A paper describes a structure:
Plastic pollution has become a global environmental challenge, driving interest in enzymatic polyethylene terephthalate (PET) recycling by using polyester hydrolases. In this study, the PHL7 wild-type enzyme and the improved PHL7 triple mutant PHL7mut3 were expressed in E. coli and P. pastoris, and their PET-degrading activity under various conditions as well as their thermal stability was assessed. Both the PHL7 and the PHL7mut3 sequences contain three putative N-glycosylation sites (N143, N144, and N161). To assess the impact of mutations and glycosylation on structural folding, we used X-ray crystallography to determine the structures of PHL7mut3, expressed in both E. coli (E_PHL7mut3) and P. pastoris (P_PHL7mut3), as well as a non-glycosylated variant with three additional mutations (P_PHL7mut3_ng), also expressed in P. pastoris.
The crystal structures were resolved at atomic resolution with the highest resolution of 0.89 Å achieved for E_PHL7mut3. The E_PHL7mut3 crystal belonged to the C2 space group, while the P_PHL7mut3 and P_PHL7mut3_ng crystals belonged to the P212121 space group. The difference in the catalytic properties of E_PHL7mut3 and P_PHL7mut3_ng might be caused by the N143Q, N144Q, and N161Q mutations. The C-terminus is quite solvent-exposed, located at a distance of >35 Å to the active site at the opposite side of the protein. Most likely, the additional LE-linker has little influence on the catalytic activity of PHL7.
Author numbering: 2 to 260
The structure:
Amino acid sequence: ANPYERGPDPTESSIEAVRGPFAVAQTTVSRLQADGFGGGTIYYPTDTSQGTFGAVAISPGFTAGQESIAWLGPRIASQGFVVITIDTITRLDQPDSRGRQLQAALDHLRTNSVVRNRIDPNRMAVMGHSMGGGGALSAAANNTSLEAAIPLQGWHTRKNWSSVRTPTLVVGAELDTIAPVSSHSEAFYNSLPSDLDKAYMELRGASHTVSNTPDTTTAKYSIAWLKRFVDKDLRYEQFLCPAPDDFAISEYRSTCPFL
């Protein structure tokens, strides 16, 4: 058996859920307490009876606060993850700095008494929007032990990601004019190793700012990806392979099967 499985057997509806199977609580990390990032909020399951959980750090993009990604916090954590949504040190931080801050936010979780006994420190992931998604890729390139990476409309000047060894779901917005998929998202996907477990999911009609308010497609497939790779949870392969059928996805590419 897989000792990392948490929660009831899934369905498409369970991964679409705004509130997942786990009740969640939250704790604030002040800027002063946050070594190497701008503070944040940690969302976590309060039920400890199924074991420890993997951890996820999420960064906003250029000019943006934690509030632009906050909705992902409880929506993902309630599926069985400890999730920290960060503020960056400054609103103008670039992608590589954001990648350092994502790693610093994960590292913080190991030290914070409210959650350190709730995490499996070996099973961690990074996500982010815009330059924060560039940051997620940078963090993965710097730490091949990360179990998943999910850039959402990622922006980066670095286009070649051949050194990444972390399963990566690249979420593009079809009509993105800030981080256009042809030169950002889908170029990143194409330069990830061909033998990596990876997928490219393009959101039909979406603008760059799609991740700044709730988007069910983004949440459901982020949850499925995190389950499949952070928890090695084979119950979630069904949602990723073969390609998802949602209208909201204009294009899907992957290295399925991952099994």
